[PDB]
């Protein structure tokens, strides 16, 4: 009921020691993006890696 399909990750921040990744949910608008802890992504690590590849390349 409360589980949804991830599309891609588009940002990352640390908030009070919490590392959070901004998730774009498949089929939803950017108004529905949420900040998720890395633990919520442990089943879609490849999606997180694609985002980390981009930010490393953009630096660079």
């Amino acid at each position: 009921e409360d589980v949804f399909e991830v599309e891609k990750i588009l940002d990352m921040k640390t908030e009070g020691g919490k590392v959070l990744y901004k998730v774009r949910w498949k089929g939803y608008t950017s108004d529905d993006d949420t900040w998720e802890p890395e633990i919520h992504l442990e089943d879609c690590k490849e999606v997180l890696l694609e985002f980390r590849k981009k930010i490393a390349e953009n630096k660079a």
Binding site: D2, V3, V6, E36, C44
Partner: peptide, 5 residues
């Protein structure tokens, strides 16, 4: 598939 906060 992920829990959405």
């Amino acid at each position: 598939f992920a829990l959405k906060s």
